[PDB]
Amino acid sequence: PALTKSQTDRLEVLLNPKDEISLSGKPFRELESELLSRRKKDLQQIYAEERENYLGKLEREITRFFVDRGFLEIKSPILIPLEYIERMGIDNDTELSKQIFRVDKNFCLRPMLAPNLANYLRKLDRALPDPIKIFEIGPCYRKEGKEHLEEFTMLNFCQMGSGCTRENLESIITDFLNHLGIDFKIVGDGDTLDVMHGDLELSSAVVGPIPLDREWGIDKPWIGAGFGLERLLKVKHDFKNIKRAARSESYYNGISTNL
Numbered sequence: 001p002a003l004t005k006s007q008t009d010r011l012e013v014l015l016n017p018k019d020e021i022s023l024s025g026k027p028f029r030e031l032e033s034e035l036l037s038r039r040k041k042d043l044q045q046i047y048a049e050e051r052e053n054y055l056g057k058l059e060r061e062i063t064r065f066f067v068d069r070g071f072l073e074i075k076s077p078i079l080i081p082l083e084y085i086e087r088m089g090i091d092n093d094t095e096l097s098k099q100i101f102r103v104d105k106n107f108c109l110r111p112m113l114a115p116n117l118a119n120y121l122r123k124l125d126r127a128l129p130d131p132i133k134i135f136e137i138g139p140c141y142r143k144e145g146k147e148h149l150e151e152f153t154m155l156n157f158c159q160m161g162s163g164c165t166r167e168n169l170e171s172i173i174t175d176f177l178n179h180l181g182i183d184f185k186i187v188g189d190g191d192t193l194d195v196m197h198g199d200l201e202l203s204s205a206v207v208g209p210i211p212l213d214r215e216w217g218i219d220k221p222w223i224g225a226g227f228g229l230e231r232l233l234k235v236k237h238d239f240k241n242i243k244r245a246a247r248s249e250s251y252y253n254g255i256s257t258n259l
């Protein structure tokens with residue numbers, strides 16, 4: 001007869017975007033047996049050829065992109081002090097005690113790469129010539145009220161000093177997403193920009209100095225942008241849900257591991 005809602009959820013888990021089949025008068029067991037055989041063969045092809053994870057391979061492809069363009073690869077701690085978040089302009093219980101994974105009474109999981117990269121910009125200005133170009137790829141954490149990934153991988157590149165203009169920032173974003181093969185559109189008039197993909201925010205870039213720069217020893221012009229790698233993988237592979245691209249035991253490269 002007709003497929004139930006739970007049976008449809010099960011088949012959608014085993015359903016790849018490349019599959020060109022409709023959910024045909026066949027029973028649920030026949031459809032499930034077909035998708036199971038396809039997903040098993042898909043993993044067999046990965047285990048015999050590529051064997052690289054989508055998240056890891058994307059980090060390596062992005063790293064080669066910015067290293068080739070004069071950006072220094074940064075690997076800052078994931079466990080940051082709480083004082084870094086208090087210095088970002090967040091206190092009370094608006095966003096400090098709501099979307100922050102605190103570990104000890106002093107440390108917490110970093111929700112963004114900006115505080116660590118800001119400290120690197122201050123220290124590297126004493127040794128490196130102008131301009132200072134750095135970037136980092138790493139995990140970030142934010143709770144939830146909303147609906148998004150709590151454990152995700154962030155990319156943050158930034159430049160300080162000369163050439164920190166909106167035109168230069170958009171040229172880097174354009175060359176970056178065209179390199180990967182991701183359609184986008186820049187939205188902006190707030191002194192900030194939004195890199196959108198239809199209705200999904202890929203990145204939120206910041207141009208020019210910010211009054212908050214004084215609290216981080218920053219007194220030069222700077223540009224930067226932060227991309228979520230799980231959101232990028234969802235767009236490139238046309239995943240219906242972003243959880244197929246995140247760190248999980250339930251999916252490998254958008255393929256279900258519950259076979």
Ligand code: NA
Nearest residue numbers: 189191192207
């Ligand atoms: Na602006």
